Amino acid sequence: KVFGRCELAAAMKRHGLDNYRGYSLGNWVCAAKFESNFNTQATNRNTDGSTDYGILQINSRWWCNDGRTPGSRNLCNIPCSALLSSDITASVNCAKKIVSDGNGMNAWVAWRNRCKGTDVQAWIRGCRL
Numbered sequence: 001k002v003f004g005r006c007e008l009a010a011a012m013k014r015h016g017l018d019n020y021r022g023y024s025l026g027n028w029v030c031a032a033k034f035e036s037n038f039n040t041q042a043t044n045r046n047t048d049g050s051t052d053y054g055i056l057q058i059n060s061r062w063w064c065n066d067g068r069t070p071g072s073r074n075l076c077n078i079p080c081s082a083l084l085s086s087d088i089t090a091s092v093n094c095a096k097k098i099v100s101d102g103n104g105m106n107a108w109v110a111w112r113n114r115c116k117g118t119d120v121q122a123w124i125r126g127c128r129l
C-alpha cells in the first residue's frame with residue numbers, strides 16, 4: 001500500500017506514535033517519507049547481507065526474521081514479511097521497541113541525516129488529526 005501523507009499521519013496517531021518517547025508525529029511522517037516514500041512494500045539489501053523492510057525500513061540483523069541473515073536476532077519476534085502489510089500494526093509495534101533501545105530516533109540513519117533539526121511539523125500541516 002502507498003499511503004498519502006495525511007493518511008499515514010492519521011494511522012500513526014491512532015497506533016500511539018504521536019509523542020512516543022518524546023518524538024512528535026511529524027518526526028515519524030518525515031522518517032517514513034525518506035525511508036520508503038510511504039510504501040509498505042519497500043525492501044532494500046544492505047552491504048552486510050541484512051535487509052530493511054516496510055514503511056520504516058526495519059533491519060533483519062536485530063529486529064525481524066527473514067531466514068537469510070546469519071548470526072542475527074529477531075527482537076520484535078516477527079517474520080520480516082509482517083512489516084510489508086497494508087496494516088501498519090507490526091511496523092509500529094516494532095518501531096516502539098527500536099526507539100526505546102537507548103539512541104532514540106538516531107537508530108534511523110535517514111531520520112538523523114534528513115529530519116533531525118528540521119521543521120518536522122510541516123509534514124502534518126493541513127491534516128485533519
Ligand SMILES: [Cl-]
Pocket residue numbers: 005
Ligand atoms: Cl509527500
Ligand SMILES: [Cl-]
Pocket residue numbers: 024025026027120121122124
Ligand atoms: Cl510534529
Ligand SMILES: [Cl-]
Pocket residue numbers: 065066067068069070071072
Ligand atoms: Cl536469519
Ligand SMILES: [Cl-]
Pocket residue numbers: 021022103104105
Ligand atoms: Cl531520545
Ligand code: NA
Pocket residue numbers: 060061062063064065066069072073074
Ligand atoms: Na534476524
